[PDB]
Each structure stands twice: as C-alpha cells, then as structure tokens.
Structure 1
Amino acid sequence: MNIAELYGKMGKHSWRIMDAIFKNLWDYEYVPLQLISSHARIGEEKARNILKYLSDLRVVQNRQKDYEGSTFTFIGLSLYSLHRLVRSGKVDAIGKLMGEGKESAVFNCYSEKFGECVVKFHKVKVKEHFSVLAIRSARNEFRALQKLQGLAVPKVYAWEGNAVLMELIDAKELYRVRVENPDEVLDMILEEVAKFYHRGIVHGDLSQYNVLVSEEGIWIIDFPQSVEVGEEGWREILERDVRNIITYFSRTYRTEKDINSAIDRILQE
C-alpha cells in the first residue's frame, strides 16, 4: 500500500488514537490501552478496535505479553509525522519515494509554500525505543540544518516527529560522478567542513554518499548523526570526516592530500 493511500484510510478517531500514542512515548515504549483511551477521549473497547485495525494496516504494533499496549511502526510514525506536517500547512501532498536506505526513507512532496521538496522519514551510556530515537535523529538533522543555513546544504522547512521537510537538491551523490577536477572538489568539501566547524557543527558521517555534486557546485546532506563542537568526541568525529573524505579521493582519484595537515588547517581557524 502506498503512503498516500494509507493516509486516505485514516479518520479523525484514527488520528486521535495516534496523537495519544505519540504524546505518551516519553514514558512508555508501549503505551497502555487505558492511557491511549483516556488521552484520546475514546472508550476502551472502541480504542481497542481502532488499534487492531491500525495494526492490520501496519501503522501500529500491539503487544499483550505483560499488558495491552501499542507503539508506532516505522510506517505509522512516518504517517503520523506527515499528518502533523499536513495539519501545520507545510505539506499538501506526499508523492513518490525518492529513495530509502538503512537510516531513512525520503519522499518527494509538494508544498504551496515551499515548492517541490522532500520529506525524509528517519529510522533508527550502555553499549548493548524505536520511536523516541527516530524522532531524536530527525530533530538533530533539523537543528543542524537550521544552524548551517546559508551554506551548501539544503534549506530546511520543518520538523515533526521522525520527519524533516527540506529543499530538493537536484545533484547526484559524489560516488556516481567522475569529476575531472578532484583536487578542487576535495578542497571545496574541506572548506565546507571548515565552515560547518566555525558554526559549531560536525557532520558525523561525511562520505561519498552525502556529498552531492553538479557542474554548479557541491552540497552536503544527511545530518542525523551530527554533533556540536564541545560535545563528547567531537574532535575525533571531525577528524574522521576529514580522513574518510580524503581517503575516498585517494582511492578513487589518487589525490595526494595529507590527512593531518588538512585536519590541522581546519582546526586552527
């Protein structure tokens, strides 16, 4: 079922049940039916019936091992976040999937206010909570993007739930483009890294999959793992972005940039 058709299957009572789960995620993975019912102002047996149907539509996951509780699936959280974007007037219609990997599904959409853009639905102490973590990923990307506006990143329009609404950049990932001036493209990427750093942001996963290129220039995308300068490990995270991108150029193009100097140059600004 496409996300547009799924959206059409939702009534007001369906959205009120989802609003109740969403607002109780801060203290439950699986929100108890009794609290879904009381928050939504929908009687228990009817709330139950709604949740069963949402489960059949793969919007929520219901469990009953310890108690009757519910949470969002990735599909459901995304659909709910889209609803929030639609009710806030930021999005008018969701369109076709643009692509999907391990971390997000990105869809085309149209907004009367922002034009033809994209909505990115995010997935995913003690090294060893789907919704809370996805929503944190989305908000992190959003704040990073806001702090970087005016640099070579998408314009960012809104954040709700696990969804970030932003500019469509018409440019391919670096890994699919043979460039003929690799030394200059590498230098432009490292300059933009230095510009991020002066804004207090480290990207956190810079690679050939999140640098976009066209004859016009480069852009950098995908900030859910970004950190603020001063946060634990930020310097090593920065060094890793520099190292990884330079390594990419060395292997693909035999560019001869020295990693320690490049890092040292950025950090001394």
Structure 2
Amino acid sequence: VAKLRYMSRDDFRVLTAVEMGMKNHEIVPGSLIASIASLGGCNKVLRELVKHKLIAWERTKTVQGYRLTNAGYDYLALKTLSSRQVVESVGNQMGVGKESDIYIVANEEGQQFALKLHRLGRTNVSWLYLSRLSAMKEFAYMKALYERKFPVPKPIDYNRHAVVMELINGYPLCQIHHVEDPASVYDEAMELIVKLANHGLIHGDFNEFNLILDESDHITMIDFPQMVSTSHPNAEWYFDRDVKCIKDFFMKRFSYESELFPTFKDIRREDVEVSASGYTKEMQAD
C-alpha cells in the first residue's frame, strides 16, 4: 500500500472532504469538511489549501464555506494517477476540447501521453458531477471506438474529470496551412464520418479543432463530447452538418472542393453504445 501513501495525507483527506460535501452543497461549511475529513489539524490544512489555490472561500447571505477549485479537482485526479504510476509530471497545455483542457504528461519512465481535464457545468454541484461524467463518457467511448479500429487515441486511464490517453504525433488540422494532397485528407475525414454512421454515431462537432493530422497525413479524432445516434429523428441534419463543416474548412484552408461527399441514405449499419454503456457502468461501480 506504499504507493497510496500520498492519498493518506491530511491535505488530500481535507480536499477529498470538500469534494464529498460538494455532492449536496454548493458551498461546504468548515464544520462539515472537518466532520467528513475526521483527522484539530483541519483549519491549518484549509488555510494551506486556500494559499495553494486548491480551494476557495465563499460567503453567501445564508452560508459560508469552501469550494474545490479547478486546480483542487485537478490535484485530486493527478495525485490519484500519480499513485497508479500513470502520471508523474504535467507539462504545457497543448490545446482544448469542447469541454476540456489538453496537456502533455509524462509517466516515471519519461514516456509522454495526452491528459484531458474535463470542465463542464455553470453551478459548483453540477461542475463537480458533469466534469466527472464528461471524462467517464470520453473514456468509455474512446475504449469502444478504439476496439472497433476507429482512428482515436488509445485510452490509458481515467480518474474523476481526467482522461489519460495516447499522445498522437501530429497537429490539429486548424494549425495546418499546407498539405501534400488535400483530396486524400478530405477523403479520410469523409470516411470517418461514414464509419461513425455505420456504427450508429454522428460526431456532432466534426471540425479542424478535434482532428489531428500526423506526419503521414493520417487523421485521429480526439474530442467527441455530444455524439448523436443515427436513430435520432433529426440524425440526417446532424450528419449533413458534419459533412458541410469539413467541406467549408477544405475550401477556406486548402482551396479544395469536391462533389464526392457522403449522403445519409448511403449509410449501412454494420454495438458501440452498448459497449460504451457497459464500460461506464464498470467505472461508476468503482
């Protein structure tokens, strides 16, 4: 149990207590944090967590207490991943997903991976829950898609709002101004839309920001937060919208256009949702 010693420290215990109270409270009173933490040393720990910006103090006309900050939630997830030897160091923020921040991380051996920290919700309670669910969904769908030979990063690990995955050696399509053969890349992006639809899925946000181009000009999909089922009554519109977004990008960036693009009637169903739901339930159990 030596690997879990940092999870036993007082600051981690108090941070976990703030997270626990945040399940039913928008602002966690110190008395409740102290009661949950069951360490006394509590107030001194709270003051250091505030100093390190891991928690923030909040006053309401009826309540006073603390909330976990984004840095505090990141700390809990990153220390958990560190205990498993998955993440030893966190580097530069490389980019953004629709509802997440992307960083390069390294394990003890120095091998690099991508870390996605999910951030969703406009209240403390829904932020805690939605960020975790968004990461859980990404890990479950990434696993289900990777097993079906889809071009997605290999999923490595998960904790709270954090997903660790394979670091793709490439750049998002939005940062690419020159490509050797625009037609091949356009065909590869269109084939991804088709493969998804044949598996019952419509991306919903298919664009130059979530498609990574490697040194061989091969595309990897790295963000898919709000996929639509091909069974949705308005699935055709969602499918056509994804096709059109990539057509607009190829015209604007590469001056490339084609009359050869996918049609929703051309889909032929080959289940991903069943596998992803099974993985989500396994993760929810733990």
Change (3 A) 1:185 1:85: same
The residue matched to 1:117 in structure 2 has which SS?
Answer: strand
1:82 CA drift (Å) = 0.7
Structure-2 separation of matches of 1:134 and 1:252? 33
**Secondary structure of 2:163's match?**
strand
Asked if 1:34 is matched to 2:31, the reply is: yes
**Pair 130,189 (structure 1): closer, same or farther in 2 beyond 3 Å:** same
Tell me the residue number matched to 2:137. Answer: 140
- 1:117-144 Cα shifts (integer Å, max 9, x gaps): 12121223xxxx3322222222222222
State the match for 1:194 in structure 2: 194
Name the CA distance, whole Å, in 1 between partners of 2:232 and 2:173. Answer: 29
Match of 1:247 in 2: 248
Match of 2:69 in 1: 73
Contact 1:138–1:161 (Cα < 8 Å) also in 2: yes
Structure 2 vs 1, CA of residues 244 and 114 (structure 1 numbering), >3 Å: closer, same or farther? farther
1:11-90 alignment, distance < 5 Å:
12-43=9-40, 46-65=41-60, 66-90=62-86
Asked if 1:182 corresponds to 2:182, the answer is: yes
The worse-fitting range, judged by mean Cα deviation, of 146-155 and 226-235 is 226-235
Worse-matched range after superposition: 240-249 or 190-199? 190-199
Distance 1:113-1:268 versus aligned 2 partners, 3 A rule: farther
> Which TM-score applies when normalising by structure 1?
0.81
2:89 is aligned with 1:105? no
Residues 118-176 of structure 1 deviation map (CA, whole Å, 9 limit, x = unaligned): 2121223xxxx332222222222222211110321111111111111011111111123
State whether residues 236 and 264 of structure 2, in contact with CA within 8 Å, keep that contact through their aligned partners in structure 1. Answer: no
Structure 1 letter corresponding to 2:163 = V
Question: Which residues of 2 match residues 108-187 of structure 1 at below 5 A?
Answer: 108-111=104-107, 115-124=111-120, 129-149=126-146, 150-177=149-176, 178-187=178-187
Deviation of the 1:69 alpha carbon: 2.6
Structure 1 CA distance, aligned partners of 2:27 and 2:84?
A: 27
CA pair 257-24 structure 1, distance change in 2 beyond 3 A: farther
Query: In the alignment, which residue of structure 2 is the partner of 1:221?
Result: 222
Distance in 2, matches of 1:229 and 1:112, equals: 42
Three-state SS of the structure 2 residue aligned to 1:42 is coil
Q: 1:221 to 1:248 in 2, by over 3 A?
A: same
Deviation of 1:96 (Å): 1.5
Letter of the 2:164 partner, please give it.
Answer: L
Unmatched tracts of structure 1, length 5 or more = 1-8
Instruction: State the alpha-carbon separation in 1 of the partners of residues 230 and 110 from structure 2.
Output: 31
C-alpha RMSD over aligned residues:
2.9
SS at match of 1:31: coil
Give a deviation string over 1:14-57, Cα, whole Å, max 9, x none: 100111222343322323333322221135xx423322321221
| In structure 2, C-alpha distance between the alignment counterparts of 1:113 and 1:227, rounded to whole Å | 39
TM value normalised by structure 2: 0.77
Residue-pair matches, total: 253
Distance 1:136 1:235 in 2: 27
